[PDB]
Amino acid sequence: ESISTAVIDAINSGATLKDINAIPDDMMDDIYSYAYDFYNKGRIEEAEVFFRFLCIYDFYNVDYIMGLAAIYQIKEQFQQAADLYAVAFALGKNDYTPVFHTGQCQLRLKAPLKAKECFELVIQHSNDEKLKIKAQSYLDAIQ
Amino acid sequence: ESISTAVIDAINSGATLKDINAIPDDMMDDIYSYAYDFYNKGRIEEAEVFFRFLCIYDFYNVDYIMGLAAIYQIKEQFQQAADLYAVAFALGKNDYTPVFHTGQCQLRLKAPLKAKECFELVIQHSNDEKLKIKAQSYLDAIQ
Ligand code: NA
């Protein structure tokens, strides 16, 4: 029946629609690869429908969630972007990229304080030099 | 978890085209009928544009997906067709038609092993006789 029922069931079950329907991995990879192609080519409207479907069918997948969070951030839906980046971080705590992006979202939502906090976390725990230089530049700009 | 709720809530906070209810149902039906007629009548470029519009307006409508997937197939854009057939399969209720068309696309993309898995999958799970007969023939021809 309808995807919204299936979704409520999947949440209640703590399992992904992908697992529940046993969609093969190769098929999921193909959709993701197409979706990323739209994103990289800058075709954000087409990329968004693909990524929204991906996160619906596999809501535990960090690459899907990061992809859709990047799209929201680019469309300036800062609060939705920040919410997805927080889930991505919770599912992958070795990676500070989502904490960095959330910092940029918080700045745009006029919460300089929350933003500084994110940028400090990155500087403190990330091993990604480029991420740390960006975060340090934001922290210097915000004072 | 509360994780899956957080993903779905974030995604559900933004309005979609279909959410705002600005387009009458019969207009949507007319657009689909014309797109489908253009297709059947060989006017492919026009069918392509409209079916793509339809897929953006309701990506979870299998008829829209299968419509554009079939256009890519006919245009020999076999990878794109295969990517949309994977979406149709995930949307679909045990319907193995998109899996079968994926097999034909794989075979044309010189991935016979992938093709053979598609056709095997149809034979194993499909309840559509005409479809299993085509799939068995492809399997026999590929060896
Ligand atoms: Na970005």
CB nearest to B86's CB, from A7, A30, A46: A30
Q: How far is the C-alpha of B132 from the C-alpha of B97, rounded, in Å?
A: 10
How many Cβ atoms from other residues are within 10 Å of residue B140's Cβ?
Answer: 9
| Angstroms from B6 CA to nearest CA on chain A | 7
Distance A67 CA to ligand 1 centre (A): 9
- φ, ψ of residue A118 in degrees (nearest 5): -55, -50
How many Cβ atoms from other residues are within 10 Å of residue A28's Cβ?
Answer: 19
Radius of gyration of chain A (CA): 16
Q: How far is the C-alpha of A129 from the C-alpha of B27, rounded, in Å?
A: 54
Nearest CA in chain B to A81: B10
Buried b (16+ CB within 10 A) or exposed e, A60-86: bbbebbbbbbbbbbeeebbebbbbbbb
Q: How far is the C-alpha of B120 from the C-alpha of B114, rounded, in Å?
A: 10
Q: How far is the C-alpha of B17 from the C-alpha of B52, rounded, in Å?
A: 14
| Angstroms from B73 CA to nearest CA on chain A | 16
* Domain extent listing, chain A: 1-143
Q: How far is the C-alpha of A89 from the C-alpha of A25, rounded, in Å?
A: 23
Answer whether B97's CB lies under 8 Å from B81's CB: no
Q: Closest Cα partner for A11 from B13, B60, B2, B92? A: B2
- Cβ pair B5:A23 closer than 8 A: no
Which of A9, A26, A43 to substitute to test the interface with B, most B CBs within 10 Å?
Answer: A26
Nearest CA in chain B to A17: B90
Q: List, in sequence order, the alpha helices (H) in chain A.
A: 3-13, 17-20, 25-40, 44-57, 62-74, 78-91, 97-108, 112-125, 129-142
Q: How far is the C-alpha of A84 from the C-alpha of A10, rounded, in Å?
A: 18
- Of the candidate CATH numbers 3.30.390.50, 3.40.50.1110, 1.10.287.3610, 1.25.40.10, the domain formed by B1-143 belongs to 1.25.40.10
Q: How far is the C-alpha of B56 from the C-alpha of A50, rounded, in Å?
A: 9
Q: What is the dihedral of CA B12, B13, B15, B18, to 10 degrees?
A: 10
